[model samples]
Target chain A: NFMLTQSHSVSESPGKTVTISCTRSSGSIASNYVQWYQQRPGSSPTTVIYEDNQRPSGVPDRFSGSIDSSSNSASLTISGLKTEDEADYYCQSYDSSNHVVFGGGTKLTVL
Target chain B: NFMLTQSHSVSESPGKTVTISCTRSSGSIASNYVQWYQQRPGSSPTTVIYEDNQRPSGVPDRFSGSIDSSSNSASLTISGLKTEDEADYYCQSYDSSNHVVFGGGTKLTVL
Candidate 1:
């Protein structure tokens, strides 16, 4: 059984870039697409990146996704961040059994 | 408002059953499979029910999901609720635009 682990919280100033990592406990991180979702305070989550690195319509390009086979991890990067970008970001994927696994979530604080 | 909507909050005592509803703003709720997620405070969301009524392994049988054509909505029912069951519930579904949409989420209070 593989698990997705992420930082509990991270902080960065406005206009700076922040990258959150999601490491898979075991198996190829490339086995499946990793989706990223952003959940603002008191709101449900919204997908910022889907299918590993694909951005959905209406999502800003400043938000990006990537996978590193060398590290067995997926990453979500936000460039030119703004205060509105501060939220809890989650990484998600399906295991071999099609069971969904979600990262603990990273709280981005844009101060 | 998001494409999907739900009650803001609900509360019930342990061993009591509660039902939460997710109503789609447009299109039939049956047009796509509805997924239900449970998110405890400070934790990532986990899929409780997927494909409308299918519960993943390790999930209690007390958790069930169904779609109501007459009401054009999706519903999640938790029977004999446990204190540990208290969490925020979100409903999700895919659209023809190839976008994943989620409900505003409902906070379940098991006091």
Candidate 2:
């Protein structure tokens, strides 16, 4: 089984940039694609990035992702944060058995 | 892009059976994989079913999934509900466009 762990909670002020890291403990970061999702309070999680840095159509440009195979980690960066950006972020990847796994999630607080 | 719509909420008692539906619009269900996730309060989501009906390791047998390509929909069924089963359930599907979409989520209440 693969383990996806995210950097814990982070606090950032509005209009600043913040990055959240997700590390894979038992998998290759380059082999498997990483997906980033945003979960606002009391709402369904929405996809922000997929396959490392690829943003789906309609996703805001303020959200970006990067993968570092050497460190076996993926990161989601949010620029110009807004109050609405205050939420939990999660990164997901697939295991050797093709089972989907998600990171513990990083809580972002916008001040 | 795909649009996923799930039945908003469901209520069932212990030892009862309940099924949550997620319908996709503008996508081929047969060609895509559907994943079901369980999100307990204050916790991140966990993948229970992937690639339609396949269960991940350690997942209980009571949780099952099925796909109906004809109806362009997928379903997650719980055979014997318990108090701990009360949580939000989300259905996810990926499109060829690299967009991963999640349903609005269904809140399951076990009484």
Candidate 3:
């Protein structure tokens, strides 16, 4: 019962800012918590944001998350992007009852 | 930060049962939520279980999850292994302090 759509791909130069969005269509976005994850090639995906906009330790301040209740959408913005930031980004939310939903995922290219 | 350790690789014959373990540390197992995800090659991961043992709709009933608070660990069991079940599995958990963290992932092979 959760429908999540995300940006497909983004290309930006190093030191630039990039923002990726995830739009929720059919689920209870207000009831569930939205999080963001970064997956580098050949490595495990790690959480960059949790519980909507809370950033965990060890994650750089360049990354941030925001949710717009009116739009039923969430966005992850990366400032001062580095070469290492080239990876896949995913938005995830878990319903209170049963399912965990993940966005289609976005690929970031550092130019 | 919370740490989740899972088996690196597992092999099973078709129709056999396979159980993968995920051990956790520096977190409260009782209050925390444990989720399992299946990632087929070249595709984004999908949720198999959330909050330890609840399966989502469309997921086969053969897949199940369990948590042991005493040992601070979780397990994912596949009752009927098939070729489609061969994929990478990751366990995830949320800690009050660590936010969200994921396991290193396990590669399951069905022979």
Candidate 4:
């Protein structure tokens, strides 16, 4: 079984940097790809980082993702955060075994 | 970015079957497989179906997905629905450039 865990919530001020992490229960972080999604209060989730760090064309460069082999975790980092950036962030990982896992989601509070 | 459209909301009684559709606005629906996610209130979304119709381990068989070329859309059908299944559902797809796009999401109300 695959599982992804993350901090339930995080708080940061605007214009600051915050990194939300998702650690896999087992297996190397690099073995599968990770995706990051941002969900505003009333809207469907939008992908900020896809394929473990690839930013979508319309998304701002402030959002990025990376995998830490040593920690067996994937991270989504946001820089120059704005008030509008306050939302829930989720990390999903999938591999060749057809296993998929979504982090519990981090509530980013831009204070 | 291309668009995936879905109904804003739907209501169904418990034990009844409900089918949610995701229609593509541009290009052929068969061009790329679709993914379906379930999001409960105040929680992260989970993948119930991926790659158009593949279910990850642990997902119940009542939750099924399919792509219909005749309708130019993908569908998520829930059989033997339970109140616990009430949530918002979103359909996801990627463009040729791998830009992820999601439908507006449909609120599934199980009463």
The interface root-mean-square deviations, each candidate in sequence, come to 1.4, 1.0, 1.4, 1.9
What proportion of the real contacts between chains A and B does each prediction keep? Answer: 0.89, 0.94, 0.72, 0.89
- Provide TM-scores for the models: 0.91, 0.93, 0.87, 0.90
Report residue A18 deviation for candidate 3 (angstroms): 1.3
Between prediction 1 and prediction 2, the one with superior DockQ is 2
**What lDDT does each candidate get?**
0.90, 0.89, 0.87, 0.88
Give the alpha carbon lDDT tens digit for every residue of B13-91 in model 2: 9999999999987757656789999999999998888889998789999999999766779999999888998999999
Q: What's the best-to-worst order under lDDT?
A: 1, 2, 4, 3
lDDT per residue, candidate 3, A1-111, as tens digits? 667899879999999999999999875576788989999987788989888888878888899999988888999999999999999999988665645788989999899
- Model 2: clashing residue pairs? none
TM for candidate 4 is 0.90
> What pairs collide in candidate 4?
none
Instruction: Give the per-residue lDDT of model 3 (tens digit) for B53-103.
Output: 988789999999998766778999999798999999999887766367799
Candidate 2 per-residue C-alpha lDDT over A1-111 given as tens digits, one digit per residue, 9 for 90 to 100: 878999989998999999999999875888778999899998999889988898878889999999988898999999999999999999998777766789999999998
Misplaced by over 4 Å in model 1 are: none
lDDT: worst 10-residue window of model 1 chain B: B93-102
In model 1 chain A, where is the ten-residue run with the lowest total lDDT?
Answer: A93-102
Model 3 DockQ class:
medium
**Off by more than 4 A, model 4:** none
